[PDB]
């Protein structure tokens, strides 16, 4: 028994694109007619986007979908490897649910890390999460992102309710569609940070915005299981876990922490690793990619 | 000065530490323009002049009351999880003294072109033949990229640490807190 030559996994947990609109505080629950940040070109030639003169808060809107069925690949060659992988993920999902993963994901969703440069230096930030079952909204969460730091995944009651909703999604028992709104008290006349193109700011039609993959790379920053050090915090879960800013390869394959090594020891060599490594493995399977030759 | 404070930056992978020292420098500049004062100096004990790097630790120089006024303001909000703090210490003895300086040069002379034509109102060919582009000087000083609040622009502000002296005399520090005569203990 060996691996398939090609193997690809469609992603679950699909974000949207996050457009930015502006308004002043205390209309945090009257935010329906807020105009958006338009981008302007000043002077080489440099595009620039600024907050309006009489507004200190930013409305960030995107949408989440949870799909489920994360063990099935989208393309596979030989059936023995596929059925071995399916029974392996069956033993994983029936030993333990998605509860630790959904807990870490709702923890990362509660604090507004998805404003990357747009979080630090803010007065007050707060998120507001709506479950939309039918065309109307069915439930509501509320978290202050300043309460939850960027250093640890904590515990809370409403966070646990969000986590069981996410684990209900990942188990395949229901459909999850979530509207995520964020507010951020920063001040007036400051520069906003949308995505940079290849210099121009990324824009939806007359409105600056955020790429979907930036939101996705934010939302999967749960890898707290690096082998060398762990005072670095959480990592965007990736095989050959690395970082484009710091520039170093954690879980390097000279060590036995590389994702493919854990995979072919679990599936082929039949040596099940530690449980947090199994959580990292299922997180990478949630992320998706190209696996094979 | 008489008292110093070393705050240590937290090891951050998802933001490179030059950006954290940039936003810390911007926080210090807006703090000094908010509170004022002329006897507030800066020092960085981990200067590597060979790679033109500033390091991981920075040191402010003020009195005790200015120090505990600086720790009693909301400029520390939002980034307590992003760096570590220090304690109001006495300077050891003896310690040598040096400088901190922002050295700018005529790095691309189009500013000199526009200033010379706003003053002289001559032809552009006169500004082309008067001073060439070889007046661009190159600097091996550590630099820090700061934005602005009014005229928003990323610019590298160089850091020059002066020679090692022995006695500190009277001198001030500007709104950027660099040495304009005021000396700081290097240790």
Minimal Cα–Cα distance from B12 to chain A, Å?
Answer: 6
Of the three residues A187, A221, A255, the one that is the final residue of a domain is A221
Three-state SS for chain A is CCCCCEEEECCCCECCCEEEEEECCCCCCCCCCCCECCCEEECCCEEECECCCCCCEEEEEEEEEECCCCCCCCEECCHHHHHHHHHHHHHHHHHCCCHHHHHHHHHHHHCCCCCCCCCCCCCEEEEEEEEECCCCEEEEEEEECCCCCCCCCCCCHHHHHHHHHHHHHHCCCCCEEEEEEEEEECCCCCECCCCECCCCECEECCEEEECHHHHHHHHCEEECCCCCCCCCCCEECCCCCECCCCCCECCCCCCCCCHHHHHHHHCCCCCCCCHHHHHHHHHHHHHCEEEEC
Between β-strands B97-98 and B184-185, what pairing exists: parallel, antiparallel or unpaired? antiparallel
Interface test with A, best of B14, B15, B18 (most A CBs within 10 A): B14
Alpha carbon A17 to its chain's center: 12
Domain match, A146 and A285 both: no
Specify the CATH number of the domain B3-104+137-185: 3.30.70.2540
Does residue A227 share a domain with residue A217?
no
Tokens at B83, concatenated: 């760096």
B169 touching A (Cβ < 8 Å): no
CA gap B181, B187 in Å, rounded: 19
3-state secondary structure of B76: helix
Nearest to A276 by CA among A219, A217, A223, A218: A223
Q: How many residues does chain A have?
A: 293
- What is d(CA A257, CA A194) in angstroms, rounded to the nearest whole number? 35
- Measure the CA–CA gap between B155 and B25, rounded to whole angstroms: 13
Residue ranges covered by each domain of chain B: 3-104+137-185
Count CB-CB contacts under 10 A for residue A56.
Answer: 21
Smallest Cβ distance to B11: which of A191, A232, A235? A232
* Cβ distance of B11 and A48 shorter than 8 Å: no
Separation CA A51–CA A55 (nearest Å) = 7
Q: Among residues A220, A259, A257, which one has the least CA distance to residue A237? A: A220
Contact B13 A190 (CB under 8 A): no
**Record: contact A245-B81, CB cut-off 8 A:** no
Tokens at B142, concatenated = 């550590």
Residues of chain B with Cβ-Cβ distance to A146 below 8 Å are 78
B83: contact with A, CB 8 A cutoff: no
CB pairs under 8 A between A and B: 38
B13 vs A146, A189, A243: nearest CB? A243
Q: Would you tell me how many other CB atoms lie within 10 Å of the CB of residue B83?
A: 16
One domain, residues A108 and A78: no
Gap between the Cα atoms of B149 and A24, Å rounded: 19
Q: CA geometry: angle at A148 spanning A257 and A64, to 5°?
A: 75
Verify that A138 and A269 share a domain, yes or no: no
B23 reaches A (C-beta below 8 A): yes
Q: Which of A120, A189, A233 sits opposite B79 (nearest CB)?
A: A120
CA-CA distance, B181 to B175, in Å (whole number)?
A: 13
Assess whether A84 and A177 both reside in one domain. Answer: no
Of A121, A151, A246, the CB nearest to B78: A121
Residue with tokens 């824009």: A203
Method used to obtain the model: cryo-EM
Beta-carbon contacts of B20 under 8 Å, excluding residues fewer than 6 positions away, are B9, B12, B82, B83
Do A35 and A133 share a domain, yes or no?
yes
Q: Helix A157-170 vs helix A99-110: angle between axes, to the nearest 10 degrees?
A: 120
> Which one of A233, A234, A236 would you mutate to disrupt binding with B, by most B Cβ within 10 Å of its Cβ?
A233
Place of tokens 């640890």: A152
- CA geometry: angle B98, B102, B107, nearest 5 deg: 140
Residue B33 burial by Cβ neighbours in a 10 Å radius (0-12, 13-18, 19+): exposed
Nominal resolution in Å? Answer: 3.2
Task: Chain B: give the shortest CA distance to residue A17, in Å.
Answer: 21
Q: Which residues have C-beta within 8 Å of that of residue A192, sequence separation ≥ 6?
A: A20, A37, A49, A50, A51, A58, A118, A208
Task: Among A221, A241, A276, give the residue marking a domain's end.
Answer: A221
Contact B81, B171 (CB under 8 A): no
**Whole-angstrom distance, CA of residue B7 vs CA of residue A187:** 27
Q: Do A177 and A248 have their domain in common?
A: no
Q: What tokens were used for B134?
A: 């070889």
**Catalytic annotation, residues of B:** 29
Same domain, A213 and A256: no
Segments forming the whole domain that contains residue A139 = 11-69+98-221
Do A146 and A290 belong together in one domain?
Answer: no
Last residue of a domain, one of A221, A247, A274: A221
Q: What are phi and psi of A287, to 5 degrees?
A: -65, -40
| A92 CA: distance to closest CA in chain B (Å) | 31
Q: Rounded to whole angstroms, how far apart are CA atoms B180 and B173?
A: 5
Same-domain pairing of A89 and A119: no
Which of A293, A291, A281 lies closest to A101 in space, CA to CA? A281
The answer to whether the beta carbons of residues A252 and A238 sit under 8 Å apart is no
Based on the structure, what is the number of domains in chain A? 2
- A146 contacts B78? CB cut-off 8 A: yes
Q: What is the CA angle B63-B66-B70, rounded to 5?
A: 135
Contact call for residues A214 and A116 (beta carbons, < 8 A): yes
The CA angle B157-B96-B33, to the nearest 5 degrees, is 35
Within this chain, do residues A273 and A137 fall inside the same structural domain, yes or no? no
Asked if residue A172 and residue A65 are part of one domain, the reply reads yes
SS3 B156: strand
Cβ–Cβ under 8 Å, residues A18 and A195: no
């Amino acid at each position: 028994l060996s691996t398939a030559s090609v193997l690809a996994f469609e992603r679950k947990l699909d974000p949207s694109d996050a457009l930015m609109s502006a308004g002043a505080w205390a209309q945090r629950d009257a935010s329906q007619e807020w105009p958006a940040v338009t981008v302007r070109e000043k002077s080489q030639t440099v595009d620039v986007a600024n907050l309006p003169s009489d507004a200190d808060t930013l409305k960030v809107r995107f949408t989440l979908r949870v799909l489920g069925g994360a063990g099935t690949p989208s393309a596979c060659n030989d059936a023995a490897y596929r059925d071995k992988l399916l029974q392996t993920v069956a033993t994983y999902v029936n030993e333990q649910g998605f509860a630790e993963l959904a807990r870490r994901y709702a923890h990362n969703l509660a604090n507004a890390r998805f404003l990357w440069r747009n979080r630090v230096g803010a007065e007050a930030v707060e998120v507001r999460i709506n479950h939309i079952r039918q065309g109307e909204v069915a439930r509501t969460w509320r978290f202050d992102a300043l309460a939850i730091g960027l250093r640890d995944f904590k515990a809370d009651a409403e966070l646990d309710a969000l986590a069981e909703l996410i684990a209900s999604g990942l188990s395949g028992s229901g459909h999850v569609l979530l509207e995520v709104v964020a507010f951020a008290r920063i001040g007036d006349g400051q520069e906003v940070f949308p995505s940079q193109e290849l210099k121009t700011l990324y824009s939806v039609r007359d409105a600056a915005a955020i790429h979907s993959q930036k939101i996705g790379n934010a939302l999967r920053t749960i890898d707290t299981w690096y082998p060398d050090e762990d005072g670095l915090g959480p990592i965007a879960v990736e095989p050959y876990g690395s970082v484009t800013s710091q520039g170093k390869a954690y879980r390097q394959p000279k060590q036995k922490l590389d994702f493919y090594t854990l995979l072919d020891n679990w599936v082929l060599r039949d040596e099940a690793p530690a449980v947090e490594q199994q959580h990292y493995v299922i997180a990478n399977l949630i992320r998706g990619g190209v696996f094979g030759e | 000065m008489d008292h110093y404070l070393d705050i240590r930056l937290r090891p951050d992978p998802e933001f490179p530490p030059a950006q954290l020292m940039s936003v810390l420098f911007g926080k210090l500049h807006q703090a000094l323009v908010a509170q004022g004062g002329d006897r507030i100096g800066v020092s960085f004990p981990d200067l590597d002049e060979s790679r033109s790097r500033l390091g991981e630790r920075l040191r402010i120089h003020a009195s005790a009351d200015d120090l505990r006024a600086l720790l009693a303001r909301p400029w520390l909000e939002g980034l307590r999880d992003h760096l570590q703090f220090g304690e109001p210490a006495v300077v050891p003895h003896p310690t040598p003294y040096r400088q901190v300086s922002r050295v700018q040069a005529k790095s691309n002379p189009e500013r000199l072109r526009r200033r010379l034509m706003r003053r002289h109102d001559l032809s552009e060919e006169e500004a082309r033949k008067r001073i060439p582009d070889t007046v661009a000087r190159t600097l091996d000083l550590p630099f820090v990229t700061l934005r602005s609040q009014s005229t928003g622009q990323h610019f590298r502000l160089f850091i020059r640490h002066g020679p090692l002296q022995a006695t500190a005399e009277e001198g001030g520090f500007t709104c950027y807190g660099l040495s304009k005569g005021g000396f700081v203990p290097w240790f």
